[PDB]
Each structure stands twice: as structure tokens, then as C-alpha cells.
Amino acid sequence: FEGGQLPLFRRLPKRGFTNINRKEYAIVNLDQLNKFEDGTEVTPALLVESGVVKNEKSGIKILGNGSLDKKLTVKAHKFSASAAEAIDAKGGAHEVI
Amino acid sequence: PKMKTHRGAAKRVKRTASGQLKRSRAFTSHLFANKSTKQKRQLRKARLVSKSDMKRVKQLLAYK
RNA sequence: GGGAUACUACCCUAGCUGUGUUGGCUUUCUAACCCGCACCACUUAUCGUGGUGGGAGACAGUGUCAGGCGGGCAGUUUGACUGGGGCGGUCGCCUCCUAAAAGGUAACGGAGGCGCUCAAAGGUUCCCUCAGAAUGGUUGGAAAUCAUUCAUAGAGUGUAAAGGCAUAAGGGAGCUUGACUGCGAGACCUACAAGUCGAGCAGGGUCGAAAGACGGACUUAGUGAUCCGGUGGUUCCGCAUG
RNA sequence: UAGGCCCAAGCGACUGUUUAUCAAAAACACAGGUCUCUGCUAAACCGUAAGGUGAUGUAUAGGGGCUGACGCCUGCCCGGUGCUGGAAGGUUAAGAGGAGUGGUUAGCUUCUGCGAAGCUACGAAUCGAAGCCCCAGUAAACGGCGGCCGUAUAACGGUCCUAAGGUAGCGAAAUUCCUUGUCGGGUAAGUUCCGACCCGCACGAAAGGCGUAACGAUUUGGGCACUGUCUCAACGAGAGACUCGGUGAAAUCAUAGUACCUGUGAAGAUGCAGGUUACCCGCGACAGGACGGAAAGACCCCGUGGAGCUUUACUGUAGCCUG
RNA sequence: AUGGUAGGAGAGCGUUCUAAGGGCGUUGAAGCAUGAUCGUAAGGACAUGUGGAGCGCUUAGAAGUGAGAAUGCCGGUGUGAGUAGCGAAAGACGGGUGAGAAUCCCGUCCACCGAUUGACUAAGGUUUCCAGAGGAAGGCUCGUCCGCUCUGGGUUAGUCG
RNA sequence: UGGGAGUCAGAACAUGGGUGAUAAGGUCCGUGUUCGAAAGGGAAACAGCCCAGACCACCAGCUAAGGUCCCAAAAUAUAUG
RNA sequence: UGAGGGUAGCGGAGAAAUUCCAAUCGAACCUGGAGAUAGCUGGUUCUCUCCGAAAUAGCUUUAGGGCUAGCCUCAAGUGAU
RNA sequence: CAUAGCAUAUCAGAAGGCACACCCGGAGAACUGAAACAUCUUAGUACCCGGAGGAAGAGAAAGAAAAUUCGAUUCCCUUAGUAGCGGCGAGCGAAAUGGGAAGAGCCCAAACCAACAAGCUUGCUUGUUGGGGUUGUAGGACACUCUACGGAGUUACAAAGGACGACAUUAGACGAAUCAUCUGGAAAGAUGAAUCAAAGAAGGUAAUAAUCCUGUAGUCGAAAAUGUUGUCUCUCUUGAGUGGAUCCUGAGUACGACGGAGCACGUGAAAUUCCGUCGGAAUCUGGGAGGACCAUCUCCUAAGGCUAAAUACUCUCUAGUGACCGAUAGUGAACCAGUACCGUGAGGGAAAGGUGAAAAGCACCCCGGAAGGGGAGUGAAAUAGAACCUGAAACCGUGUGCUUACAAGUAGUCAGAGCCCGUUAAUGGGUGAUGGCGUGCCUUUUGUAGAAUGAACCGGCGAGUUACGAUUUGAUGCAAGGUUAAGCAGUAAAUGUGGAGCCGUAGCGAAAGCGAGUCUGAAUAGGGCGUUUAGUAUUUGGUCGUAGACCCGAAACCAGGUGAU
Ligand SMILES: CC[C@H]1OC(=O)[C@H](C)[C@@H](O[C@@H]2C[C@@](C)(OC)[C@@H](O)[C@H](C)O2)[C@H](C)[C@@H](O[C@@H]2O[C@H](C)C[C@H](N(C)C)[C@H]2O)[C@@](C)(O)C[C@@H](C)C(=O)[C@H](C)[C@@H](O)[C@@]1(C)O
Description:
- With about 100 residues, chain A is of the alpha/beta class.
- Chain A is about 25% helix and about 20% strand.
- Chain A contains four helices and six strands.
- Chain B has a three-stranded antiparallel beta sheet with strand order 1-2-3, with no helix packed on it.
- Chain B is elongated, with a radius of gyration of 15 Å.
- The interface between A and B is medium-sized, with 10 and 18 residues.
- It is classed as ribosome.
- Keywords: antibiotics, resistance, exit tunnel, RNA, rProteins.
């Protein structure tokens, strides 16, 4: 309440809508995968067991922020281009579940 | 009991990464012919809620 | 000739056959229904119930829906500033003075304007330049038009006033629509919302021989959020799927 | 113990009734008038209704409105509003008709419009009573009864416009701003009173006009009687009072050893300054101050505070009328 | 460096209760009263009287945690003050009773109401009626008196309502 | 940058101005001071004027504004009018 | 004028005065909603230390209220601005 | 005639009062907030009425959902102050999913069959009885095929009604162990020496007791009883599987139009579910739902009924508990309480506790009419004497040391003689001739000695609190991770378990989506938000929000009742 001056949230206009069925993905970067061993095959269940992912929301997504310095195979729902590239560069495979 | 959210503000503003609130611009949605194209395109640029207004409306959006 | 009888609603002027049946008008019927209607019994009893006779009658009455009227009744409203209040006047924006040589600065302090206009009164390229004054003459208003010379903006500038203008920002002519799209480092103003100016970068254009100038008018007023609703495009989203 | 009287103006006819607790009156009632409604399960009223009053009445009756005995009277306007009636001219919602238009589908060319059969949402061509518009009437219905210039529709003239512009009778009035209007009477002296005048700011005919005998704890003016009302106060009788004996409250109250003058100061001082006066303590009396007591001012302003009433304020509504 | 109201920050004193530890108390606890004591403050001890059973200290922890004002609420008590008032009216004397008499009983005189200060009956009240006893409270004074207190008694209907 | 406030009745004096009447202890702005929220000394008393900003003791001293006849501390001082 | 009865608060009664309805009436009284609401008034309890304002723009059915800025305080940080 | 109606015989089935606290229906406000107010909100709240009950209500898919699905109903934690509704304002506010408590599916109508009576002529129909069966990737009848007490279940669906084997084993009973001295009026205290403990809980006793009393732990115990518990006589249900071709599968119903209400949804596209008025169907090749409507898919099969548990409240009862009160507190009420008292009435509504261990409660004498007292006496104590523990201040008095009748006063303060006294013994105390200075406190104010407010005095009582959530500071633990909620086991604790969920580890964008980048843009350009580490859990303080929200105070509004003495 501003004393009768029109409040800010009526001076301003509304915009947008919410998508009720929106996909959000559990995020994991390459720097988190360095804890594993070379040649290992990582999966969502193995991620959860290792504690890297507390909650699989709509799938798991691999992003290329950090540096890998490893060689392993990965099975996930979505990947980023940089992530797949940096996986295959050191050796390894990405299998879209 | 729980605090309640101001819904009119909720569907007028969003929260940025650090702590700030990003808003939409007024003086749209109606007569532009009196205005210039410069004003038109510049009222499409987003802005932030001012801190003087945050000091007043902070509690309305705590759950945002 | 003023229509107007090809074919065809078709027809006033026509009279005109009855039709599965349906849908309106007006009378007449009665068993629905109604009679604070008459007699007779329950009865002890004018309530009420029942039989008989009379009235009225598919109207009335009642339900639901719609329209009109409705201070009879109800809930509410009926602004602020103000040398007390009231009456009066005013309420937003622009320009001067007040304002004390930065900016800003009050009063029911002193003066005025805006609530637009323009397809050229915008852009560009070329050219051009005051009134007034006398001088002097057909006209002559003495002065309108015409002609020489000083005139310093006292000319003129769409619109109030102020700041500016011969780079003409004033006056004409030729082309043309930059009165475009998307951004904009950075700055002014500012409680917020807002408002103001911008080099320059891409894109694709106009004028000009070209450098280059053009993101509306010499500048500053010519509006007003939000919610709601309407119109056109869309790469967006939605219901199990389309 | 047991009526004061006379003369003259208003108001109201009279008897009556009224604000228990500041108003008894000119206010209300009244008997008489007038208008309007009502044909009986009357109208009107109470109630959701059933049942009731009206009325065990029936237009010489009943309800409502205005006026208010009696006498003389009661003028102009139907343009506007209301009420009544009529022509019915035209406008409408719910409703009956569905002519046509689209979403969708094996349906038809499979690159695509019979929309077909069908499921579906829109939809005028018509009418559809009230109301509304229009016409007439109604003023003891609501209301109105003049602007302009000669002049203080004053006198007569015009015009302005709508529908008309004040008849009788009253008139410085319970009504007259200027106003103590002017003239006369009454008094030695008359802002009142009486009578007369009309220049009615702004009288007027049933929100009745004018007048009226009788009546009035009514208003008003003058006179006689009479008196301590007064010049002008005096003396007496009781009760309080005062002294004594018994009994014994209350309002109020920051603490108090509580003076006056001139100044000062929140602009009016027991308490401050400078001076003046003043031995301590009582009783009877007075009322100038303590802005004395009493009552969180009732006048005035404010509050986006309340309540009551009004209406052509907004929004509704019981209810009524019509389908 | 250290004046200070709205106000911000900080450090502390006390009150009741709880935990733990360690203590005091009929050779007298808490409360109350007095004192010339200690601490920068809130405040803390000691001594003596009174009283006659519970209470401190240390550390921490919880709060119904501190009053001079609200025309505050409840109780006590003042002031005004020996003041106002003691509610319409004729009493006087003698004798008596008694601790005590203007006020109670008896007697004489006097006076008042007298279409009433009289006598009945309803309503209402509900034992205030009658004998004794009583003077603590009530009686606007007093009191030997009383509609007050205590004890005990009292209302009789075929015809009255 | 953030946590917590309170405030939105202002007054006089001096100076620059409007208004008013070159009136107001008037009113409205601007520039400074004081009071507000500031005791102390002076102006007789006197929020706003002059001096000057109180941590606490002292029967110590130097000064400010204002003063030195008595009230009532200090010159009945000097010199010249 | 008496005794029995009747009319009840969005109501009744009124020879009409806002008059009466249990010492009250422009809408009675008792309970409850109810600790209604009160931008208004009053009040709000122990001590010391440090710092220490404002009475102003701007918007406001706004004017003795409120919001943001100004000016106060506390804590981190930058670190000559 | 017939029945109404009337008249008898039998039974006692109901009324009223509930604890209207909880539950279900009918009816249904206003103050208030929105800084006015009308949609909205307060709120389907308060009040009123009716029902039942110990619980009530709901309840077994014409569902929820879109996985590869799921468990009838109810309740708790989350989802989430999300999605959504909204003068899109104030504000209102889900659900699914998931984790858990408790866990239960049973019966009708209709088909069909076999008998019974009347019409009819026993053919059929009607109705009565009995079987049979009540469900969908379709169930049943008819068509098809071979079995029953194996299990045995009274909380519905049948029942042992059973010898049924501690109601709580409940009134009740038993229940270990101490002497002495000192002080004392009296010891439980001090001192010293002993003892019991499945009992050291508590309270009384002349003061503070494990061993004095009542008791406690524990043991033994009976009526109404059974704990309602274990084979428990009878009785139970050992299933009959395929196609479903034909028949049946709840009518003035579903559904629609109009007007309304309830659902988180503001009445409208209302999808979904109810009321009133008008219309009004389909029948398994059927019908309904999946937020207008059409088609394809998925799920289900309405218009019939019953149903325990987990859950809600406490006028009561039994046994107990408390960093709850301790007589102005705490119930209004510790006592004479819903009583004195007030009011016509509905209704309102107080004050008021304490002798002492023991009544041993003052024999007797004296003054006095008595009340009162003074002695004596009881007692530890009588200034403990019933107006009885302690006994504060205001207020009222009596005695005295200093002082005062020439003095102008916010009554004190600094100075200071004289007089009197003699301490928590320290450069002491009391009084005060006289001099100087000096206009109370609080609140409100530009400013108050103010003739502005408030207080007669004294005492007592008398105002930022708690819950939940947010934010920010301090503390601690762990750390790319941190953390549990409900529930369960446990002493109404700590703790243990419980990983559904929550925050963070990545943001940008309306969104699809992309991703250390993204959005814009035609473009990567330019710019905005971002990256280039640190959070999380509990708690402390400060502040805010929702609740009465620091306390007292209106005029008034509404609902239900009381009054015409
Ligand atoms: C007999 C018994 C009564 O006497 C009166 O009424 C007298 C006769 C009033 O005279 C007056 C007489 C009359 C003319 O006024 C002068 C009239 O104007 C007022 C209303 O009552 C008084 C005094 C009034 O004062 C005045 O009230 C005025 C509102 C303001 C005035 N002000 C200047 C302080 C103040 O003094 C005020 C209202 O009565 C006093 C209040 C407390 C009362 O109501 C008191 C208790 C009365 O009941 C009174 C004692 O009983």
C-alpha cells in the first residue's frame, strides 16, 4: 500500500503463461563424471547410487561445462553437443536411452 | 499459518539468478501513433524492480 | 406512352372443390377446476366432510419464465485546496517574471497559451533575401501595384511566450517519401512509474556529379497507466490423439 | 368564607385535546362543505398464507384527501406533471415457426467443397400484449397568474412566449426591505395602539377571501377602582440564623509557611523581577479573584465516523400491471 | 573524546520458578522496623529488635519479570468540620420506675384534626399481632421505650367472602 | 550493500524578496544562526538576542559577552572635551 | 375512575407534540455476533554507556494519515573517491 | 351391501429432557476488510429449528489417470500457498502422484425354472411361495463341464447359546528395618553408634523421619465377573471351465432449455454434481466419462440397497501428571454461590480463608448497671484471648531534645553560629539564629510556572505476548552435498528407525526449447540476465506477515428473546 497512489503491481503489465506439462531434466556436467573410473558404463541408477543425482525429474541431461580427463560410456536421455563431443574426443560412447 | 503470495505480482514479475526481480514495461498495449518508433522499440527492453520498491514489496514474493 | 401482361411469386378486380392433418380468431358446450351458494345429513356444530339443485368455466386462481412500473421499503454515495468554513474560483501540460548572474525554489502571487495542424508546412540538391522610411509617380486610400537608396531583423518564421536564426532555422524551384526495419556505447532528469538526447553498427533505400545529408516540421505543449474487450500475423502452448 | 369593572383591536367559531419532566397556544379535534374510490368474497387495511376488520353493514352506505360553525362569496389558465378515456398510428422481451450459415465425418475429386445422410453451434422473413408516441377531458387535482421600454399591461400602448397574466374583497397587515412610510386621534410627551392613504420589495379567494354575536387560565392597547410596585424606606410577629448540650454528612482536594503595585511571561501571575506593606491564632458577615466548583463544549471545524428524514442521487426491491 | 528529545546500538541490576552442585536454619528462616554501611547506577550486606518455619549462594535455563500518572479497578483512610442538616404541627407540672429520664408509665390542665390526623371494607404486604425478658446493633438526639432482638404463644364458620 | 528507525503542526532573529498598507509577535519562499533536543554567564525578570557547548570532585587560577557609587564582585581611576 | 383482558420494536398506539411504549425513544430492554471497527484521545512499569535526527521535495477521495527519497544508527566492504 | 367414521379387548410404540461439546440436514445475518462502496469479503460464520448416535457421515468404479497404469471409503504428512479463481483488486485456493495409519466386499430387481389360487378353461395371463443371479479385455439365464465342509470364523455377509482356562484378577488382607545423649515446651534436627531395601514415592506425628503411624515396592486374593480368550457341539464355502450366438441387466430416468445454488472456479463455453418449471431417449451393433463441440483411442456400465477399522468431541467416571494459581491469584464461587443483593421480567451478580501441638478457650478476687478492663491462673508464648499467624503505609494520638509571635514563603538547596547527643567510629549524628540561589511532576506542544490535561492520600492489581510462516544477523554440525515429515518402537523423554518430500550443485527465455551460455535479432554482431563456487539443518536476537496482536475507550449494525403491573 502506497497511500492511494497506484501500486507498482498495477502500474505494471502482466505477461506470460505457464506450461503445466513442462520437461525439466536433472543436470550433470563432465567435471562430476571425473570421480568414476575409465571404461565404466554409467547409467541413471548408477548416478543415483553414487549420489550425483538426488532426483530424476524427467530424465538426465549431460552438459559440457568442465573438463572430463576420462574415458567412459554414458547412457542418458539428452546430451549437449559439446558434451557428446568431449566424450567421444577422449574415447567413449553416448547412447540415448 | 503459511504466508500467502501476491498473485498479481507473481504473474507480473520473475526472479533472476542472484536475487533480483525482472519486470515488464508500462505504456504499451495502447496508442502508439502519438509515440515514435524509438519509444516503441525501447519500451520493449526489460528492466529490474527498483530497490526502493523492493524494500516495500519484498515479502509479497518470498516464495517466488 | 407513366408503369406494364415471354417464363415466373402471380395477383387486387373476382366467385371458387375439399383434402393426411396441423397452426391463429370468435361463439357454444360441458365431466377438470372454482363459488365467504341454496337445501339436506354427519351434528352435539353456520368450521369442515358428503348428496342434490343452481352460477361461473377451460376463463379465473396457483406454479415457472419474461417485460414494464415501483422513496411504499432498503442499502449506500453526495471530493479536495481554502489566511475558519461556506458561496465564488481552481484541479493535467507548455512558456515568461517572481527566482536573489549554476541548477532548483512557495503563495486563492503577476501575465499568457495547449487538448493541434501539415502529403508539403517533411527529406535532399540548387538558387534567392528585410520591412519601415522617404524619394514619385496611371492609378493614388496621403499609403494597395510599380522603381532607386538606406535600412540589422524593428522583416519573416502554422500555432502562446522565451531562447535562437543570413550555417539562414526566412523565401522559391526540381526530384522524392528516412514521417524505414533491428539495435545502440554513453549521458540528462528523477522518490517510483515515467520522460529526454545520442555518436555509431548491420540491413535495405531517396536526393546530389561527388564528399555526404536524411530514424518527421527552428526548439520546448498538442494527452491517460493497469484490468477488460475487439482485429490481423505467429516458430509458441494446451486436452489421451488430431 | 363567597365576582374587580369598562372601552377597543387581532387570532381562533364554540365545548373539548396537546409536547408525563422548561411551550396549553393563533397549533390538533370538531359540527358543516367539497373532490375522489368502492355494485359486495365491495374498495381500503393486517397477515407469507389460511383467516379476519370493514360489516352480522350494501351508494341517504363505507374508505381516503383538502377545507373547517354561520353569513356574502369562491375569479383566469388544461400549455407542463398527475388521473381518466380513446384512436389504436407505430416499437418490443420471453415464445411459435428454421429460410439460410458454419465446427466435425468413412462420406467426393484423395491436393480437397452438394455439404452432403448425419452429430452439432449460430441464425431473419414474420408476427407477439403491456408499456411508449399521439388526441380529448379534468384545476374545492399538482401547479401558474409576467417579462420589455412611456412608467412608481401602477393608468392605458404595444410587443416577448408559453396556456394564461390577479375578478370581487382586503391592504405598512401574525405578510412592508427602504421604515419609527405619510396624515389625523389619543398623551405634557406615543418606534406601540386606533382610523385613513396605496407607492401590495413579496395579499388574494376551500395549503379558502372578507365579515361576524357568543365564547377564551389566548395576544394587544387604553381607562376607573385599588394599593409598599414605586418616590423611600420604617416597625413589629414567627422559622432558619447566632450561643449552649446531643448527633453528625457532602461536593472538592499535586504539595503548600498561599499579600499588593508596576512590569515580565503561552501576549490577563499568591508562587517570576524590582519595590511597597504586613505581630501569631480565631469568630460573625460579603462576594472581587483563585481564568472558582459542577458537565472529556451541545456553538464552529474535522473524521474517506454514525443515525433520522427527503428526492427527477446510484443500485435494488416487497408489491402491482401485462404476456 | 564523553549536553541531549523521536530513535538506533551495547552492557548490566533486581523479581518468581526449574536443573545440578554446595550450604544456612528453634543456639531462631522468610517477612516487618531501625541504623551514622558498601557499590559508578539499577542495588547488595552486616548488627539489633519483632516473628516463629522455611531460605540463601554458584553456573546455566524459563518467564504472568520491575508502575507515579490511563476523569484507570478494588479496598482502607483523610479534607471540608465539630461545619450543613436532624423531614411541616403546643405543650406544662406533679408522682412513679429505674444505675441513669425533656424524650418511658400514671394523673390534672392545655391544645390540634374534626366530609377528618375519625370508623369500616377491598388490593398489596406477610407474623410487623399478644405476653414476658433485653439495650450490643437499628431508631436522624436520648431511651428504663419500640413495628428492633430473644423465648413462648395467638387466626375456630352449614348461613361471612 | 544490507539490518533497524523516527519525522511529513515548526518558532524567533538577521539579511534578499513577493503579498499586505515600504501594518502586524502577519503570511509565503530563499540564505545563515539559535531553540526544538542546550544547562551555564549577560540583557531586571524574559525558549529563539550577545557570550559560550555541563563526564565527576576542589573554600585554586586566566579570560569572553557585559561591567567596576550602594543594593551587588570589580576604577567615586587617569587625561581631554 | 376501578377490576379483568387485547395490540410489541423492519413493530405498535397516537383529538398529531417525533408524542407514549416500566424515572430512557428521530426507533425500548436483555443476551449473543464481540476483544465489532476506531487513520482519534489517553496510557505503556529498572539502571548506566556510545551515537544522534526531522518538522522537507514528490504522489495520494490527499492535507493532524500514508508510501518512497532526504537526514539518524548498527554491521560488512571498497578503499582517496 | 361396502368402508369411512363411530364403539370395544390387548399391548405399550412414541412424546419430554439431550452434554446440542462432536456428527447430519433445513434456514441463514450484520458489524468488518476492500483504507469510501455496490460484485467480492466477513461466511455458509454466529444465532434459530429438526434429527439421531455413541460415534455420525462416506463407502466398493457408468472412477482416477494417460504408465507398461492404479487399492472401495476415511484420516495424517507432502505435493503447495503450487496450478487456478479474482472490481485479475482485497483476497480465495485445489487435485492427481508419492509416503503412511487401518484394511473386508456382501446383498437385491430382472432374465429362467418348479409348485399354489383367480380369471380363463386350465393353454395363456395375473398375482403368491421357493430356488437361481446380480457383472464388462461382458456378467448371468438358457448351450456346453464335473463338484462341497477342504478350509472351517459371529465387525456386516450363517453360527458353538457351548468345559468356555487371570474383567483390571477390582472391593480387600499381609507387607523389612533404630537406639542413645544435647538444645528444646515438643525432636524427625546436631553429635554417635546400628539396620532394611524388588520398599530412599508421598503425607502425618508438638520442629526437617527409608527403619513412629497411614502407606510404598511386592505377594495373596471373591461377587457382579470371565481377559474375551485358546480344539471351541450344530453349522460352514472342497469353484465347477468355453463361447457368449439369442434373452435380461434399475424411465417420466439419463439428457436438454430457462432460472439458481454447490464444487478452489465470480452462472458462464460449465466440462463435472444438485433444486424448481417445462420438455423428454436409447437398450450390448447399446450407453456414460476423459473441462465447449466433432472423429479416433483409453477407462467404465447410472437411474436399487447394507457395510466394521483407522477418525471427531468430553457434562461425566477411575488412576495420575505439571520450570500451572496460591485467597484483588486461580472457577463467578476454597467460606453462607449462581447465594445476600439489583431488576416487573428476560437477566445481572458480589464481598467473605489462617488461635494454639493440645481447648488446656482465662476458676477465683477487684472497679463497673452491663460492656470493658486490672490482677491471678493455663500455655513455650495471651501486645497468641476468638474483632484470635505475621501486622506495612496512609490516618489518629501522648510524651519529650532543638526551634518559633517585625514576618512575604515550589518550602528545598550551598554556606553557617548556638544548643543537644554519641555511630556499622568516620575528616560523626539531630535541630537550625542568619545569608545566597531557586516558579512542582506527567502529557501534549513552535513554545507550558502556566489561568492547557491528569492525579485527594496510601496500598494492591494494571499494557509488544504466543503459535505458524518469511527475511536477515550471531552460534554450531556437516559440506558438492545438507536434511528429514508423518508413522512405528520407547517413561506424555532423550534416542533409534523412517528418504515420500525440501534446498543447493546452471542459467536464459512468454514458451517450445537450448545450455556455460541463452534471449533478441535475418546476423554469432551489439546489448540484457548469467559463469568465472558454497550451501544446507537446528537454534539465538531484530523486523515483518496471518491471527483481537501493546492496553482501555464509541455513537451505531445485526440475530434471538423479555416487557402494555
Ligand atoms: C436545578 C438543577 C440543575 O440546574 C441547571 O440545570 C442549571 C440551571 C443550568 O443552568 C443553565 C441555564 C441556562 C440559561 O443557561 C445559562 C442554559 O443556557 C443552560 C443550558 O443551563 C447549569 C448552569 C448548566 O451549566 C451551563 O451549561 C451550559 C451548556 C454551559 C454553561 N457554560 C457557560 C459554562 C454552563 O454554566 C449545566 C448544563 O446545567 C449543568 C449540568 C452539570 C447539569 O445538567 C446539572 C447537573 C443540572 O442537573 C443542575 C444542577 O441539576
